[PDB]
Design an enzyme around this catalytic site. Structure first.
Site, PDB file in Angstrom:
ATOM      1  N   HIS A 505      -4.547   5.619  -2.957  1.00 16.45           N
ATOM      2  CA  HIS A 505      -5.434   4.798  -2.127  1.00 16.45           C
ATOM      3  C   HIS A 505      -6.146   3.730  -2.905  1.00 16.45           C
ATOM      4  O   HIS A 505      -7.291   3.298  -2.551  1.00 16.45           O
ATOM      5  CB  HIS A 505      -6.480   5.715  -1.463  1.00 16.45           C
ATOM      6  CG  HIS A 505      -5.923   6.546  -0.325  1.00 16.45           C
ATOM      7  ND1 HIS A 505      -6.700   7.371   0.433  1.00 16.45           N
ATOM      8  CD2 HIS A 505      -4.645   6.551   0.270  1.00 16.45           C
ATOM      9  CE1 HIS A 505      -5.932   7.928   1.401  1.00 16.45           C
ATOM     10  NE2 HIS A 505      -4.692   7.425   1.303  1.00 16.45           N
ATOM     11  N   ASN A 550      -8.375   6.466   4.929  1.00 12.22           N
ATOM     12  CA  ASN A 550      -7.106   5.974   4.431  1.00 12.22           C
ATOM     13  C   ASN A 550      -7.036   4.465   4.689  1.00 12.22           C
ATOM     14  O   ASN A 550      -7.382   4.003   5.745  1.00 12.22           O
ATOM     15  CB  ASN A 550      -5.960   6.729   5.073  1.00 12.22           C
ATOM     16  CG  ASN A 550      -6.330   8.174   5.424  1.00 12.22           C
ATOM     17  OD1 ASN A 550      -7.271   8.440   6.239  1.00 12.22           O
ATOM     18  ND2 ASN A 550      -5.588   9.107   4.859  1.00 12.22           N
TER      19      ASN A 550
HETATM   20  C1  FAD Z   1       3.020  10.621   0.302  1.00 16.02           C
HETATM   21  C2  FAD Z   1       2.135   9.447   0.748  1.00 16.02           C
HETATM   22  C3  FAD Z   1       1.138   9.674   1.744  1.00 16.02           C
HETATM   23  C4  FAD Z   1       0.296   8.601   2.167  1.00 16.02           C
HETATM   24  N1  FAD Z   1      -0.339   8.708   3.381  1.00 16.02           N
HETATM   25  C5  FAD Z   1      -1.246   7.815   3.741  1.00 16.02           C
HETATM   26  C6  FAD Z   1      -1.900   7.913   5.073  1.00 16.02           C
HETATM   27  O1  FAD Z   1      -1.753   8.954   5.759  1.00 16.02           O
HETATM   28  N2  FAD Z   1      -2.575   6.769   5.350  1.00 16.02           N
HETATM   29  C7  FAD Z   1      -2.774   5.625   4.659  1.00 16.02           C
HETATM   30  O2  FAD Z   1      -3.309   4.615   5.145  1.00 16.02           O
HETATM   31  N3  FAD Z   1      -1.971   5.487   3.598  1.00 16.02           N
HETATM   32  C8  FAD Z   1      -1.258   6.549   3.097  1.00 16.02           C
HETATM   33  N4  FAD Z   1      -0.433   6.327   1.983  1.00 16.02           N
HETATM   34  C9  FAD Z   1      -0.474   4.968   1.322  1.00 16.02           C
HETATM   35  C10 FAD Z   1       0.315   3.936   2.119  1.00 16.02           C
HETATM   36  O3  FAD Z   1       1.677   4.331   2.108  1.00 16.02           O
HETATM   37  C11 FAD Z   1       0.108   2.550   1.496  1.00 16.02           C
HETATM   38  O4  FAD Z   1      -1.297   2.224   1.556  1.00 16.02           O
HETATM   39  C12 FAD Z   1       0.929   1.477   2.215  1.00 16.02           C
HETATM   40  O5  FAD Z   1       2.298   1.779   2.268  1.00 16.02           O
HETATM   41  C13 FAD Z   1       0.807   0.156   1.464  1.00 16.02           C
HETATM   42  O6  FAD Z   1       1.529  -0.822   2.189  1.00 16.02           O
HETATM   43  P1  FAD Z   1       1.993  -2.155   1.388  1.00 16.02           P
HETATM   44  O7  FAD Z   1       2.941  -2.831   2.348  1.00 16.02           O
HETATM   45  O8  FAD Z   1       0.770  -2.875   0.877  1.00 16.02           O
HETATM   46  O9  FAD Z   1       2.803  -1.675   0.109  1.00 16.02           O
HETATM   47  P2  FAD Z   1       3.981  -0.608  -0.244  1.00 16.02           P
HETATM   48  O10 FAD Z   1       4.209   0.341   0.944  1.00 16.02           O
HETATM   49  O11 FAD Z   1       3.723   0.038  -1.593  1.00 16.02           O
HETATM   50  O12 FAD Z   1       5.254  -1.510  -0.190  1.00 16.02           O
HETATM   51  C14 FAD Z   1       5.326  -2.698  -0.970  1.00 16.02           C
HETATM   52  C15 FAD Z   1       6.718  -2.953  -1.468  1.00 16.02           C
HETATM   53  O13 FAD Z   1       6.942  -4.048  -2.270  1.00 16.02           O
HETATM   54  C16 FAD Z   1       8.054  -3.820  -3.157  1.00 16.02           C
HETATM   55  N5  FAD Z   1       7.916  -4.521  -4.404  1.00 16.02           N
HETATM   56  C17 FAD Z   1       7.101  -4.031  -5.367  1.00 16.02           C
HETATM   57  N6  FAD Z   1       7.163  -4.912  -6.400  1.00 16.02           N
HETATM   58  C18 FAD Z   1       8.043  -5.907  -6.010  1.00 16.02           C
HETATM   59  C19 FAD Z   1       8.461  -7.077  -6.650  1.00 16.02           C
HETATM   60  N7  FAD Z   1       8.013  -7.410  -7.836  1.00 16.02           N
HETATM   61  N8  FAD Z   1       9.417  -7.832  -6.032  1.00 16.02           N
HETATM   62  C20 FAD Z   1       9.878  -7.525  -4.803  1.00 16.02           C
HETATM   63  N9  FAD Z   1       9.444  -6.408  -4.172  1.00 16.02           N
HETATM   64  C21 FAD Z   1       8.511  -5.652  -4.745  1.00 16.02           C
HETATM   65  C22 FAD Z   1       8.463  -2.390  -3.001  1.00 16.02           C
HETATM   66  O14 FAD Z   1       9.731  -1.958  -3.376  1.00 16.02           O
HETATM   67  C23 FAD Z   1       7.800  -1.925  -1.749  1.00 16.02           C
HETATM   68  O15 FAD Z   1       8.700  -1.665  -0.754  1.00 16.02           O
HETATM   69  C24 FAD Z   1       0.490   7.324   1.643  1.00 16.02           C
HETATM   70  C25 FAD Z   1       1.412   7.143   0.613  1.00 16.02           C
HETATM   71  C26 FAD Z   1       2.278   8.172   0.189  1.00 16.02           C
HETATM   72  C27 FAD Z   1       3.270   7.860  -0.949  1.00 16.02           C
END
Ligand code: FAD
Ligand code: FAD
Ligand code: FAD
Lengths: 575, 576, 90, 90
Positions: A505, A550
């Protein structure tokens, strides 16, 4: 293609919020992800949505573990002094196996990890999407709390729609109601309990379609039959490495990518560049592009751009235990039942009176119990085998300033055991809020590189003394006190603080505020990077406050607001 | 979904894909059902290890394997937990809990046996080792003419190898691979030959190998399509195949009963030909649920109507495993041809070699890679480059060492992770023993307990046979201890051990092949056709009736190809 | 001995211990010395070791001794799980 | 030499462990990062609990220990008294 209206780095739920908004609004959009489509025919969907995973939910912990790659592993100093004398044996604890020699093991977020698959971490998350109350939430409107609240309500409402957030998908779980009612009673007038708000749609009594990035945007290339006028291309297995600043530091001129399959490097041009690579990798890509300071922090020469980048990081304290349900609560499950005779025998009948006003439980509950006790007379428990899990929370409040989940779900830990009947086990997860402090940082090595040859991330982090620390310990005790009302601890899952950052988080790595200098921040309330016309950041790294709940719903809400700016200030190309 | 196909196949693993590939290509209207779902990206049934990320973080892939391996028979748990709070609900007995099998004797189990329900089956996760069996391990396809038998196996294996893209060249430029290979070659010389493990794989780049899978055999795309306009194939995922329906005479199958897991609907599918490729455990389950063999705890006083050998004579391999840490001598040998002056990290330091010197122990390509690593990474104390591919060495089964060997690194269900010793130094040792088929070793199905899919619960009654199997298993352990010592000492935490029975996942003989049902105590003939039935065929390791050590899939594929030959000789495809 | 963490699943009558002891070449560089600053629990100079098994004969024998234990022990029985062949802490 | 120990011979290990005091324990560098945030937490792997900071953990005899009881280690030993052959003997 060489030229797009908008390019989005990352296909997690936040990148997908920009895609949904900007693809819907007519922009030629390209999205890049360093990872690949795995997940099934629904691109970026939740991996737990298979019949097999929902029949075997304990196996899903493996899926999670298999895609969480640790951010910063300090150099190992375990002593192995029982090698054979013939084996090659170290003289020093040298840099082995991808470890990071920049990292002080005692000031780390050792549990911090990242996922590189299409859909990001939403392929495996647990879908808890609460709103933050004022105390946890940054201001989007100064000097008008009511207007600020209204703006957040509008944004959260859309965000909840995109995720398909709901609070009734576990309404007919016995275990859920059992726990919910007892806690509601025990804290009557003092705290409120509800279902965790969950980005999920129930499809059947035994199957829940958990939401993911795919739910936000299906990630199919367009134009397609279902959207002949939209333009979107997703490019997996593309490592995005740098945004190219113009010399004036007012505009991004290109995005430099590395196609991991061909091995070739290209320069992609766009009007608008959105970075949604996660809280760690957004910061990494920025630092690799000339923002902030590369290398060990050195206040002597402050950086040229975004001096707050990678500072004021927050990660939540997380305490955890599991309980085994009290005899009293288990006995209460079948309290409404009429139990003729001895189980297994002809004299066994289990009946109840639908609607009886003396009944403690609703009819949907008794019908299920009755049917279970009659279909399975050898089984000693009154809870049905298919009963969905509890999903209870009392949300953060000033007098209990932590988020709580009283539930069962699959995480990277909670390595469940087989001797205790699973129907008895409830998980307790309490989440503390961490004050943002300039000294808590994520920085990147100027010499060490990661598996994709980018600057190695390094944490310098401790839970601040004062309120954060006092609260975290008060939170522990609260979990010990509250959980004791439902049953005692499960041996092997005793109350403990989890490794820093395992909770995933992390916030504030590229934080939002109104004024770069006054608020010590990197992006404004449109999520625009200060000084740059066409660069936007999305994700939890934006969140600048101390939050317990979260964060993803809050990051999504910020992204929707960001897209409003984009739509007002950039015009789509002709189709 | 139609009511009517030419061929129906149950299971989308590599054996089912062998039947699809042969039969689709020959113009039959084919449907294939799998209880699991599409799970490997856009390439349907492909190897899940074929991601850039997994190949950079290969230790993580163990978790993927573990996540899809569902144990077959878990005995009731008798672990004592006596430190619960006095308020917690507590059992008085060790009752049937958490999916456990009260039929299962915990002491006569293959506790490590497990199955995978995903499109592509276990080939989404496997280690791709595809050796041929030598005569000693291999069932006869032609009796009394060993040269005809050899010729038929060679033709079938060659074909199998083309379908899997089997090769022995993909690791040829790995320094670690060659370091171990050449050492074992020299140490045994004239006693044992060593080669690369034959691997179903194509290298894409110095850092990526495209591991083969069911998808490599057949791409699993619905047909007709632009690429295959005159072919007919539909794959139906998330469909549990439950029973084949016998006609009254027991001479033909009349339909297949399926349960679509998404809609909950049930259907009877009709086909000219029924192929069961559901794996060694689930083929047997389906057959027993359809009135073949005997349901319930075995009862010799109630001999079955059909296929009395079904689920008897099961074989599973003994597996011994350790890891070693490379000897100082071998590590020093990597840099034998180098001249090294000055002190690492200083600008006076240099590492050079004489290109082409016939006294060089290693080839130029090796020495250049050592040079570059040592000169660009002067903080590193080892001569092996960081992205050097892993060893993939074998000495194949022979009568004087009747076990298969892999001296390699790969991702398996048990690849436990340690970070204290550099991974460049670590080599895995897996020796696989052959098990005599014995009537008493059985896979059977409860008439009372059911599994997650409401089918009869699998139960094992298994022990490694006394006599030759046991003697070899232990001599195999010793061999592993002796050979491995030549490369390095054991790695603490991976000391030489027998693995849990069935963890190796090389179960055979559950529906075994033979020439004569009675005389060979078997269930299918050498066309893999079920005795008595015109149109029912079984494919998979369940067919293999012999004691084998080498990894069995290629062999089961070869049988499947033969089976398709009979099908093409006896069933006409429906006109387009 | 100081090591040997008890097990009860396997009948003790079946269990046999194997301990093979190697000889270590005396080398000048292998030392026991005493700190001139740090003191032990009785206020005497703290012992410190500077020790490795000598490469050459001592190491080759120690590993061959390992192999010999594996070879010989197999004549009596297979390894007891949890007491697998191992070098003990120096 | 008590009837109780020879009836419970697996318990004697504990007697042995109880009187063997390690000779040189290097400074401990185990990472404990799950302390409550209110607990006193180390910034360095400082000299704790009798450890010896002179000791290189990688060049130790970590198992070496001493016994301080009348009769010394003979109060615990396994009593194996072989002769050395010439090869092993000064
Ligand atoms: C087991 C687990 C349980 C969780 N449960 C909760 C919950 O219940 N509630 C809550 O709010 N959150 C929870 N989380 C956290 C939540 O998953 C994240 O806050 C959320 O997915 C973030 O979204 P995002 O799109 O910012 O990034 P991410 O989901 O981390 O995705 C970003 C992405 O960018 C990519 N990337 C990274 N670097 C590069 C690069 N240099 N070039 C191109 N692509 C790149 C990746 O491959 C990835 O797909 C959980 C996470 C996990 C692992
Ligand atoms: C980690 C790992 C490493 C391995 N390494 C090797 C190696 O290197 N060499 C090699 O020879 N072997 C190895 N194997 C074993 C190899 O994967 C199997 O022998 C091979 O996959 C068997 O192919 P199959 O098509 O008969 O069965 P499977 O691959 O098991 O496919 C059978 C399928 O049928 C399905 N199914 C099951 N029941 C039903 C039903 N009732 N209805 C509909 N569908 C159903 C499944 O969901 C599944 O997809 C390994 C396996 C694993 C898991
Ligand atoms: C579990 C165990 C198993 C063993 N098995 C074998 C075996 O079977 N065969 C065999 O050959 N070897 C065996 N040994 C080793 C054997 O015990 C020793 O070699 C032997 O005891 C050494 O005799 P010692 O009199 O020189 O020293 P010790 O027995 O060490 O006695 C020396 C003594 O001097 C004392 N002392 C130390 N410092 C001071 C000081 N500054 N002032 C005053 N007193 C001091 C002690 O308190 C002590 O009693 C075993 C040892 C152990 C613990």
């Amino acid at each position: 293609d060489i030229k797009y209206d908008v390019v989005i780095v990352g296909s997690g739920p936040i990148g997908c919020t920009y895609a949904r908004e900007l693809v819907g609004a007519g922009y030629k959009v390209a999205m890049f992800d360093i990872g690949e489509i795995d997940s099934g025919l629904k691109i970026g969907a939740h991996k737990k949505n298979t019949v097999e995973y929902q029949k075997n939910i304990d196996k899903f912990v493996n899926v999670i573990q298999g895609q969480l790659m640790s951010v910063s592993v300090p150099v190992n100093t375990l002593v192995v002094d029982t090698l054979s004398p013939t084996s090659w044996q170290a003289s020093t604890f040298f840099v082995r196996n991808g470890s990071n020699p920049e990292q002080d093991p005692l000031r780390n977020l050792s549990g911090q990890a990242v996922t590189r698959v299409v859909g990001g971490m939403s392929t495996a998350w647990t879908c808890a999407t609460p709103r933050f109350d004022r105390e946890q939430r940054p201001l989007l409107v100064k000097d008008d709390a009511d207007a600020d609240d209204a703006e957040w309500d509008r944004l959260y409402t859309k965000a909840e729609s995109y995720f398909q957030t709901g609070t009734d998908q576990f309404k007919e779980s016995i275990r859920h109601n059992l726990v919910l009612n007892k806690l509601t009673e025990e804290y009557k007038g003092q705290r409120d309990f509800q279902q965790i708000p969950l980005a999920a749609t129930r499809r059947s009594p035994t199957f829940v379609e958990w939401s993911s990035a795919n739910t936000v945007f299906d990630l199919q290339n367009r134009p397609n039959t279902d959207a002949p006028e939209e333009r979107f291309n997703l490019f997996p297995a593309v490592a995005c490495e740098r945004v190219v600043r113009n010399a004036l530091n007012s505009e991004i001129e290109s995005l430099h990518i590395h196609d991991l399959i061909s091995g070739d490097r290209f320069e992609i041009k766009a009007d608008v560049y959105v970075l949604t690579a996660g809280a760690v990798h957004n910061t990494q890509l920025l630092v690799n592009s000339g923002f902030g300071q590369l290398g060990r922090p050195n206040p002597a020469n402050p950086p040229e751009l975004l001096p707050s980048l990678g500072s004021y990081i927050t990660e939540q304290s997380l305490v955890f235990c599991q309980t085994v349900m009290s005899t009293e609560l288990i006995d209460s499950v079948k309290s409404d039942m009429t139990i003729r005779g001895t189980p297994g025998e002809l004299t066994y009948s289990v009946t109840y009176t639908p609607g009886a006003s003396t009944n403690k439980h609703p009819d949907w509950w008794n019908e299920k119990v009755k049917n279970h006790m009659m279909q399975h007379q050898e089984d000693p428990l009154p809870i049905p085998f298919e009963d969905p899990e509890p999903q209870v929370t009392t949300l953060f409040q000033p007098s209990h300033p932590w988020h709580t989940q009283i539930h069962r779900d699959a995480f990277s830990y909670g390595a469940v055991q087989q001797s205790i009947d699973s129907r008895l086990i409830v998980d307790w997860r309490f989440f503390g809020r961490t004050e943002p402090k300039e000294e808590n940082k994520l920085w990147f090595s100027d010499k060490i590189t990661d598996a994709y040859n980018m600057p190695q991330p390094t944490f310098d982090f401790r839970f601040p003394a004062g309120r954060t620390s006092k609260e975290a310990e008060d939170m522990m005790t609260d979990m010990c006190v509250m959980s004791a009302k439902i049953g005692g601890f499960l041996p092997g899952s005793l109350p403990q603080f989890m490794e820093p950052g395992l909770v995933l988080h992390l916030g504030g790595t590229h934080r939002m505020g109104f004024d770069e200098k006054e608020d010590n921040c990197c992006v404004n309330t449109d999520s625009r990077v200060f000084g740059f016309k066409n660069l936007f950041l999305g994700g939890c790294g934006n969140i600048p406050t101390a939050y317990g709940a979260n964060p993803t719903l809050t990051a999504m809400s910020l992204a929707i607001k960001s897209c409003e700016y984009i739509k007002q200030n950039f015009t789509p190309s002709p189709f």
